[PDB]
From a paper:
In natural photosynthesis, the light-driven splitting of water into electrons, protons and molecular oxygen forms the first step of the solar-to-chemical energy conversion process. Our data reveal a complex sequence of events, which occur over micro- to milliseconds, comprising changes at the Mn4CaO5 cluster, its ligands and water pathways as well as controlled proton release through the hydrogen-bonding network of the Cl1 channel.
In the reduced state, a strong hydrogen bond between Yz and D1-H190 leads to a short distance of about 2.6 Å. Our data show that the distance already increases between the S3 data and the first time point (50 μs), indicating that Yz is fully oxidized by this time. Upon the third flash, the oxidation of Yz occurs by donation of an electron to P680+ after the charge separation at the reaction center chlorophylls.
Numbering used by the authors:
A (entry chain d): 12 to 352
B (entry chain f): 12 to 45
C (entry chain a): 11 to 344
D (entry chain e): 3 to 84
E (entry chain c): 23 to 473
F (entry chain v): 1 to 137
Amino acid sequence: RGWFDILDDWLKRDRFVFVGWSGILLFPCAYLALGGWLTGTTFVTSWYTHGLASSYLEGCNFLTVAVSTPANSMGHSLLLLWGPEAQGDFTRWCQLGGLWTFIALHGAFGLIGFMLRQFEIARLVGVRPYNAIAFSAPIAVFVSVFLIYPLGQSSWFFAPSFGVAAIFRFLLFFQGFHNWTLNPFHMMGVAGVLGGALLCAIHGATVENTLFQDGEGASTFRAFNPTQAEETYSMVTANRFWSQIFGIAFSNKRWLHFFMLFVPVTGLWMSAIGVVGLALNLRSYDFISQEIRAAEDPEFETFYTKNLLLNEGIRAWMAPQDQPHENFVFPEEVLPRGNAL
Amino acid sequence: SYPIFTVRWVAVHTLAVPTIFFLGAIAAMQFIQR
Amino acid sequence: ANLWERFCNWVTSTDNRLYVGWFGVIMIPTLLAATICFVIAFIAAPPVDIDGIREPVSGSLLYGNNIITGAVVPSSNAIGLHFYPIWEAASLDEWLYNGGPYQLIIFHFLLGASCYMGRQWELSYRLGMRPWICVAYSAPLASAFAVFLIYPIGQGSFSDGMPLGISGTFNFMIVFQAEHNILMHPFHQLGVAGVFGGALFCAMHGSLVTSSLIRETTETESANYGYKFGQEEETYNIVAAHGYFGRLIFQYASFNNSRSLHFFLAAWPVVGVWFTALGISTMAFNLNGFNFNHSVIDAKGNVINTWADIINRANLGMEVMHERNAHNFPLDLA
Amino acid sequence: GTTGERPFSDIITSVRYWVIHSITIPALFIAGWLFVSTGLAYDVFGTPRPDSYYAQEQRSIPLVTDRFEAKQQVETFLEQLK
Amino acid sequence: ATNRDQESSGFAWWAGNARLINLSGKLLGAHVAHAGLIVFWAGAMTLFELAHFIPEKPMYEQGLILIPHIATLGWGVGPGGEVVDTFPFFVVGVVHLISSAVLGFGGVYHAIRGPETLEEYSSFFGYDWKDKNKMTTILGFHLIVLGIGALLLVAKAMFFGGLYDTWAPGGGDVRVITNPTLDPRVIFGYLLKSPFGGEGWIVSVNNLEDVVGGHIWIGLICIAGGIWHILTTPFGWARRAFIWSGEAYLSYSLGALSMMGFIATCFVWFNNTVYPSEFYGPTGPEASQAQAMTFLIRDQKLGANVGSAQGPTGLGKYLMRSPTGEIIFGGETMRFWDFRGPWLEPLRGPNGLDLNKIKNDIQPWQERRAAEYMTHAPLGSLNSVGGVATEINSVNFVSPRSWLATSHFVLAFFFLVGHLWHAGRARAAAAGFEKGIDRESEPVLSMPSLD
Amino acid sequence: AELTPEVLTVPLNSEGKTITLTEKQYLEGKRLFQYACASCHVGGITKTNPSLDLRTETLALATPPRDNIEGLVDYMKNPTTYDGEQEIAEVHPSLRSADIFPKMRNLTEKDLVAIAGHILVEPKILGDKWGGGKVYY
Ligand code: CLA
Ligand code: CLA
Ligand code: CLA
Ligand code: CLA
Ligand SMILES: CC1=C(/C=C/C(C)=C/C=C/C(C)=C/C=C/C=C(C)/C=C/C=C(C)/C=C/C2=C(C)CCCC2(C)C)C(C)(C)CCC1
Ligand SMILES: CC1=C(/C=C/C(C)=C/C=C/C(C)=C/C=C/C=C(C)/C=C/C=C(C)/C=C/C2=C(C)CCCC2(C)C)C(C)(C)CCC1
Ligand SMILES: CC1=C(/C=C/C(C)=C/C=C/C(C)=C/C=C/C=C(C)/C=C/C=C(C)/C=C/C2=C(C)CCCC2(C)C)C(C)(C)CCC1
Ligand code: OEY
Ligand SMILES: [Cl-]
Ligand SMILES: [Cl-]
Ligand SMILES: [Fe+2]
């Protein structure tokens, strides 16, 4: 009954917002990541790091506001407030991109805290910690995309900026430079996400349309008591419907709900790996046999080669402004363009 | 007989009071002319 | 009974391994025609002048494609929205050149998938089920109509429909972004919320039911043997899964009604995908995504770029390179 | 059950609640408004005013090009503005 | 508490209008009050458009969808679609809006004050959804009303000043129609045209004679069907084929409205006869054709021989052949060679565009129309930045053809969803399992195993 | 940067006399140019004939010179080809053709001057972007 056991008691008290030991890590970091984003999109520019407006105060709307990444010349600096670049000057810190690493790092630790929170609450209630395990896929995505990818590149400049339109630019950068649609690791991630969404919809619709009549009203929602032992819908009729419509059906409810965990979780993990590849420019950019042929045979054309022409257009037309620190000067005459346009 | 200051109380006000502050800032922004 | 009644009983029989049904009577031949034509074309079809400019695009494996680059190529821009059955061509060779297999495949397939939707209703009625599974399928079905039919209609040509291929899909997506700023369109943003959220809620529900599985096995066997097909009892403690998930957030942010929980799982991705399909369907008529190009200017009048202007720079690179030989006149109006 | 706090339905319907917050909410709003309208938000965060993006005759962006002279660079650009 | 709560009616609040399925009086008030809202919106919106109308700007630069409907019927407009008197728009606006008050008064009266069920107050007005005889009678009355309404458009066109005719000689003009088309080979030939390119089913109707003619057929057919259903009751094959319930009737109409919504979408996008491009802006095909015309005219003025100019691909830069040989504009607009429009048909010969008319007979009004239509192509952004998606802000414009086609596709799609919803529910309801599977007689449990 | 009277000072005529506009006039000429001209001239290009733009160096080399308020007001009254050789009021909106180009009807001489001031001031602010087309977007 030492002071440690007494702090443990109060942290694990049943209250409206459970705290736990993991709250000490979670609540500060998640609040400061959140607040840093809200503060930055409201009040802070990207003028000196990017040559862009990026707050409401400058006249941006919700789609174009961002906490943008620090300038390329900062490298992978931690950009601590008391560090050598800002020297404690808060205003300078904002102007140099300090909010971006502020949000990225506090968010990294808030995510750790949230996963620990899932273990902590699971252990106290005595359930298996599969929801914590599922949360590894968001973590894998966050770390690969926001931390690993820029560490492989020249600087944090090329990480995602925290904004709706900023993320769209990132998407399109990844097409023009990395040919990321062509990457089998992104394709697996796509299948895992669209498959998760399929599983989500087909399972919910199947349960809603094989319910037993457990009440007398037309709103079927009131005929479920969370304490009841019986299944609320018919696994036997669902199984038959799908066996005859689609040829196969689930028969084992446990496997069914495990599969719902497995699919999206694996998808995101697979995309995480491909982004680690892209940190190194280890792209699936090309197909050598097709380039050999195309180079030799000016009548050979596929959708593969048409898309590389699109990529070359993205790179040339977007680099000068997207990478201002490079001082790209492209005369009109070197810009790639088809006829007329 | 409920408490009025709880952990929950701190939770909602840590969010709410900056939210309303920020709203007025954004409201005022709609009248900034270049 | 007479032969017609014998046939009607077979068609609607719930004893067939696969339900046939009246929708199935249309669905089976049209899907078989679409599938057989697709497999042959993907393997063997010769190049297709998709853009009507005598510049054939090779789509098939035998003509130098792999699984990722190969496609059934959309039919020629010279055809526009004209109907091009095999019997309108002067020879199979002419029909192959102008991309006839694309029309045959997509019309047979749209028709067959629409009956797939109907056939879901039909069996649900023979089984005594509630009928709305087919409503869920309408979201992927509507999305398919959008890319294969509605969008060609709005732009005037099946040559601007989505190719039947992996890289052809990407080509369609990139050109769509340049000409509509679909990323900046809220219906697509609703479709992303729909499928991200679907994947999340799929992971959540799966992880939560699994987390609260009742101990029914030893540690050496698969816990899946704790459920027996058709058992009356539930295999997990929903109260325990609520008690975990209620505390993870707060008590009322968590479902305790299994029926409300599952309707939420159905409704979320169905609605989002409805919207993104509506997004393609209305960008077919060139009501495009938000345009904020040069929306911010300073006291003098200089353009202060936002991230929207950077997106426009990339959009411009797709615009000026796509179909590089196809435009003679400065505006790309469809 | 209930973890012992007062229900939100109870509080927001209570008179004492709206007595307290008829003031706090609009005051917090006013303060945020004042934060922007005094021009104070520009100075705390260093956000350009509509007139201080470019010098009158320069079209180039004041982009920082050095890691440790960075803060020195941003100060020099702010004084070529005058 | 006559329904009005879940415990008695069986429906939750979010499905509460379903509490009215068997309260004919309260249901009547819902329909009339709703009709009030429809008439109200037609009233308010016209006045709004009228307040915001600047007769110097084209209608399609001003975000107008209702005034172009009134202009098409002949009122307020002169040669070339020029607005000559705005008073008829005011009249149309005020008269609907005044009407919405008497509609709303009747709706709110029947919904709140009047009898909740009509069946005891009068055998004529009350009904049971399952009375197959009463139902066809109500259908028959509404049929007659529709045929009358159809003939009102004939009356406007033949006896009350005519309709705006974009095709009318000399730039367009209002015109009395005196010889409507009655030849059923034409009128019903439209129903049998294929919907694909260059045919376009009934969307291809390109002259006021066919339009007025077809509305004479439809009005007479609707009046005959009104009588027919008033005097008949459904035959056995029809009795065995349908679900006879209130909700099933709803699903049927939802299906029909969906179908109509999709057709209207394509009507406004392709048809420039009953949606004159003078009022609605150029069609997509029309704008894209107008661009090739514009640069034919420019380059020919500099001395280009537009008929022999080989393009980059080998096809003609300005002129090529369609797949059946017609001479047509080149470039990507080759997909639009089915376009037909009053500004372009004067250059058409028996083989398509005529090189000699191109060399000699292009009037300045055609160069004006084609520049105008090309710079008003139906492209633009959600926030009404006109142009392609990569255009900078400046032009505040979205074509009303875009606005009308996008909205009615969305509406037609959601009504098809509503059809499937209510149709499937109506079938399940009628068979007795819309509330779920009976545990004590689960059907699948009484069926053989699939394998 | 800001909108100074130095920026708002444009050639009145070809004989080097200048006039100096106000903020209200510049905004007026932008609103009017949007309303009347931008459908073909957005950003200083010419969609229906990209070879002729609204660049000050281009208006300079027109016959007669068009890089001054009076020369532009004259163009909006009686537009000619680039070399002066031909009147084009029939296919270019002008006061002389306000019957066929109705958006010109309501315009007055002060409105034309506002539009001309906008066209002449705008490249002093945007530089290459004005009349440069999509390369500079
Ligand atoms: C709002 C309009 C409306 C509605 C809802 C009804 C509803 C009904 N009618 Mg009525 N009818 C109407 C208008 C309408 N009618 C008009 C205007 C006329 C005058 C011509 C008639 C003449 C009429 C007759 C003569 C009969 C009905 C009958 C019926 C009943 C069965 C109809 C049926 O089986 O569906 C249609 C279902 C079918 C299987 C029919 C074949 C459908 C094919 C596949 C469609 C394709 C051909 C199509 C008819 C025309 C081609 C157009 C195409 C290009 C799109 C039903 C209660 C029947 C009845 O019971 O009478 C008491 C009957 O015999 N109606
Ligand atoms: C959950 C709590 C938490 C966590 C994990 C972090 C984590 C972080 N913050 Mg945040 N921060 C927090 C709360 C937290 N903060 C709060 C409440 C505020 C409000 C004031 C801030 C305000 C803030 C600012 C303004 C900044 C950070 C920054 C940082 C980063 C660098 C910190 C650093 O270098 O540490 C250095 C300090 C330590 C490592 C602590 C050492 C601990 C002791 C002294 C070691 C000695 C122990 C002894 C030997 C043995 C004792 C044994 C025991 C039994 C007695 C890091 C990501 C910086 C950042 O994000 O830059 C990009 C930054 O600029 N934080
Ligand atoms: C077009 C819209 C529309 C219409 C016409 C109706 C009509 C109706 N509803 Mg539905 N309903 C709607 C939308 C609509 N609803 C929506 C969106 C919802 C979701 C929340 C519901 C949910 C719902 C439920 C849950 C229930 C109804 C019920 C009813 C019926 C009885 C209403 C009653 O007693 O209220 C009494 C209310 C009042 C007396 C308050 C006064 C409101 C009046 C009627 C409005 C007048 C305002 C207007 C400006 C009048 C001035 C004009 C005048 C000069 C002429 C009535 C026929 C009830 C029913 O079916 O009963 C069996 C019922 O239980 N509705
Ligand atoms: C289609 C809509 C509709 C329907 C079916 C009914 C039906 C009914 N109403 Mg209702 N009502 C409506 C609309 C409707 N009403 C509207 C719009 C108003 C507002 C004025 C009212 C106000 C109202 C009141 C205040 C009362 C009724 C009553 C009644 C009942 C007897 C009506 C009667 O006297 O008939 C007898 C038949 C006649 C008098 C023949 C003349 C009918 C009119 C004048 C012909 C007009 C035709 C018109 C040209 C068609 C075009 C209209 C429009 C498109 C321009 C009956 C159940 C009474 C009731 O139920 O008592 C409790 C009652 O007290 N209604
Ligand atoms: C960074 C930093 C920090 C922190 C800060 C913070 C903590 C902040 C916070 C802040 C915040 C916390 C803010 C908030 C805000 C909010 C807002 C801004 C909101 C708004 C919203 C809205 C707008 C909504 C609305 C809506 C919609 C839109 C739709 C639907 C409906 C609704 C109604 C919902 C410190 C100090 C450490 C220092 C260092 C730096
Ligand atoms: C039942 C119900 C409901 C519904 C309601 C409704 C639907 C109604 C409607 C109503 C209506 C529908 C109404 C109407 C109104 C109208 C009016 C009120 C009008 C008036 C007008 C006037 C007065 C005009 C004037 C003028 C003139 C003459 C000239 C120009 C100027 C002006 C415009 C000013 C709800 C949902 C709520 C809830 C539940 C129950
Ligand atoms: C006015 C006009 C015109 C004319 C039109 C007409 C004359 C119309 C007709 C139309 C018609 C004549 C229509 C009809 C329709 C039909 C339908 C829409 C049907 C449907 C059916 C159903 C839906 C059925 C179903 C079923 C089945 C299939 C099986 C058994 C069961 C049941 C019965 C359910 C024209 C274009 C010249 C020009 C412009 C104006
Ligand atoms: O993008 Mn751009 O726009 Ca719709 O067409 Mn005109 O060019 Mn071409 O044929 Mn495929 O695609
Ligand atoms: Cl392309
Ligand atoms: Cl072209
Ligand atoms: Fe489940």
